[PDB]
Amino acid sequence: AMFEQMRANVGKLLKGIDRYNPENLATLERYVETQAKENAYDLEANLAVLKLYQFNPAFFQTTVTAQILLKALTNLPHTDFTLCKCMIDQAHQEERPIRQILYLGDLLETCHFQAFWQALDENMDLLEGITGFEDSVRKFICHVVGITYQHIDRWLLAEMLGDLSDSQLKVWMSKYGWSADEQIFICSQEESIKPKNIVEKIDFDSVSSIMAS
Template sequence: MAETMKQTVATILKSIERYNPANLQTLERYVEMQSRENTYDLEANLAVLKLYQFNPEKFNADITCQILLKALTNFPHTDFTLCKCLLLESVVENETISQIKYLADILEQCDFAQFWNRVHQMPELCNRISGFHDSIRKFVCHVVDVTLKHWVKKYGWRDDGNLIFIANQDENIKTKNITEKIEFDHLAPLMALL
């Protein structure tokens, strides 16, 4: 059934039928299937939001929330921003959608502790998206990986597979040979004093 649905949606999206409001129910069922089966189709989700834009009376807040949460699972890509730009102003004022936008903001700012606190306050919303938590963890790992690589390079540390060798200051000390040219005639008066 999932493959049939996927093929049906692909056919809709390749034609002018993507703008036909009669196809909205099929596309909405496809969004729900993505949420259940941990799949993701940005193009189909954008088509749903575009249909809501053209037909505001058919707007479904629940489907929109699922689309936004699925877009969050694809961070660091800009899918969430694309989806957000297709929302009508009246839709953005919806409390649940505002909460999801806030989640995206704090996730983008890498405030991971605050993000997880907020997610735990809205389990009924996030738990509906299969693989949501793991996808976000994958993004967090990506950020940490990129950050650590930056620091390793910046400070000249050495990455040896599973270990990072931090440069020791003693290794950076350079010895200098100092040569002084003092003639014996200049030292004679000092020697006489001793």
């Protein structure tokens, strides 16, 4: 569809210096919209957009920035969300609804899943166009669960996944191969003691890379 059709041109733009020309924002913003609708993704392009906004303040677009941040969150445990934050100055992070979105992201990063779903205005406008947003968040939660639990109450897992019906819960248990025993078996103890990072860490290389320009 549209994402695949724009992909080549955007990739070429990102390979050169035109990526620094704000005249190309109209094209990059439509690209972001397509990522949301088709549930496609391109971090490099999104960071380039944020960079263009930081360098050309008058072009700052609230909706596109919010979608970039929300999509970044759908990519946790990766460093996407943190990198985007590095590309938005304090003044803009403090503006509605960027402030609210960062707050929600904070709940996810700190793994307060119940609090996340509670604070999440389910009927939020920006979320409607972001296809698969809720399920993507669940994948991250299951990633964390697979690392931090050996066994877990069936009721608790459904709560953490956003208050799912038993039928919906079954979908996620099936996806990661979890099965009920007496509780849901997640991991053996000897396997659980292995240290596994919950979220990826940024470093000098990745950060200096985006800070270069």
